[PDB]
């Protein structure tokens, strides 16, 4: 069995590298922004024996700014470097945002009569939709167990992008879209709330001032899903949550009381979000109630008939 596994493992690693190399070669040959003279040179060195991950990264993936394949390379190489990983995530998000904005612009010109730039093939997804498509494609290929998904660093970055680029209600997007994304991808509920707590305590920009209203809304949505999950898992077994989650919702209520007060005394006139915040207060209290009941004994009596 040992000799079998060692060969199955060598073939699995070399197959992972080979697919990366094939994805690169195909993309480079098809890229409009690559001169023909270079493409023939790329085809010579990549359509043959499998190359090392260093070369694939330095000589090709990094030169062409294929940041998604850079991340797959950091995964195949067991690359321990959080800072470079996050730099690559930041470049991939920004590159995709600019590409989505460009395609929506070209569209708006068609729907208005103008002419596109020469050699531009004529309702493309909003930028936050194309961005999260890129995150999904990588996650399914790396399985979320990778070091290219440090949720403690990657979730705040994605939330930062949503704020600093208005990927919120103004354009008709769900303001909780970053949370939906990582939950559906299979991030455990406890880890989400744990990170969101750290976002709220440290107050790193842009998560500052009255925009912590949005952080509280993410916490509300995450805890809500967590509660639903626990209730579902209890019914499941008929046929972890600590007091820290309750404390976190209390502080969240205090943040909302602070934001509303500051909003009422702003220069130029009171803030327009008065009832929007009052609603969030009710939701947060409802969640603290549910969490308090579960913590207080209703969680050990979930498999029992009522």
């Amino acid at each position: 069995r040992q000799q079998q596994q060692q060969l199955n493992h060598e073939a699995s690693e070399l197959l992972e590298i080979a697919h990366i190399q094939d994805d690169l070669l195909e993309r480079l040959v098809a890229d409009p922004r690559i001169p023909e003279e270079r493409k023939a040179e790329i085809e010579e060195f990549l359509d043959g024996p499998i190359r090392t991950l260093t070369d694939l990264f330095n000589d090709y993936a990094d030169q062409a700014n294929y940041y998604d394949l850079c991340l797959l390379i950091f995964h195949a190489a067991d690359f321990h470097n959080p800072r470079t990983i996050m730099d690559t995530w930041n470049n991939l998000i920004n590159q995709s945002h600019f590409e989505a904005e460009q395609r929506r612009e070209y569209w708006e010109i068609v729907q208005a009569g103008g002419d596109l730039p020469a050699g531009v093939i004529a309702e493309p997804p909003l930028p936050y939709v194309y961005v999260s498509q890129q995150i999904q494609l990588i996650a399914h290929r790396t399985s979320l167990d990778s070091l290219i998904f440090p949720v403690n660093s990657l979730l705040p970055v994605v939330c930062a992008y949503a704020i600093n680029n208005g990927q919120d209600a103004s354009i008709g997007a769900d303001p909780c879209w970053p949370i939906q994304l990582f939950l559906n991808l299979g991030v455990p509920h406890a880890l989400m709330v744990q990170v969101l707590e750290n976002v709220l305590d440290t107050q790193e920009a842009p998560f500052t001032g009255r925009r912590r209203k949005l952080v509280v809304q993410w916490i509300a949505m995450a805890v809500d899903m967590w509660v639903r999950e626990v209730e579902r898992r209890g019914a499941m077994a008929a046929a972890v949550m600590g007091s820290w989650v309750s404390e976190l919702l209390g502080r969240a209520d205090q943040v909302l009381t602070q934001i509303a007060g500051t909003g009422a005394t702003l220069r130029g006139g009171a803030a327009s979000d008065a009832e929007e915040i009052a609603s969030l207060r009710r939701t947060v209290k409802g969640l603290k109630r549910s969490v308090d009941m579960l913590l207080g004994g209703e969680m050990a009596r979930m498999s029992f008939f009522r």
């Binding site: 003279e37 090392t52 260093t54 990264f57 330095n58 000589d59 990094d62 030169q63």
Partner: peptide, 17 residues
Amino acid sequence: KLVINKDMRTDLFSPPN
């Protein structure tokens, strides 16, 4: 085994020779 070396590469956007 990966080793990044931004120093000396080959200009991916220039022909050879």
